């Protein structure tokens, strides 16, 4: 199956997608991550 | 006699130095992201299965 929206995976051969993690652009702040299309396998800030 | 007339004016001032030019625009492009490194091994196979028994011997005599 794709990975769901806000879902990424890398590694081919996997049995689970992982939520996209909130990254840190420095300190104590964190900026949610979201994918743009369906099955993806990088997170981008999803206020951009 | 009547008195001299009054001198001419000065010209108009010097205009102030043209500004320098902006930014050359951009530093480096779009720098290639990290590597979606790792790639596990596979799992061994499993064992083979045993041999059939062996038959049984099946003779004892005649009695005569």
Known sequence: YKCP????????????????????????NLVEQCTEDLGSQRCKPCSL | PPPPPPPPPPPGTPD????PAAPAAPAAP???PPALPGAPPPPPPPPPPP??????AAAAAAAA
């Open chain 2, 51 to 56: 041999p059939p028994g062996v038959p049984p």
């Open chain 1, 5 to 28: 929206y806000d879902f990424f995976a890398d590694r081919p051969g996997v049995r689970q997608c992982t939520a996209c993690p909130p990254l840190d652009l420095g300190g104590g």
């Open chain 2, 16 to 19: 102030q130095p043209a500004a």
């Open chain 2, 30 to 32: 779009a720098a290639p």
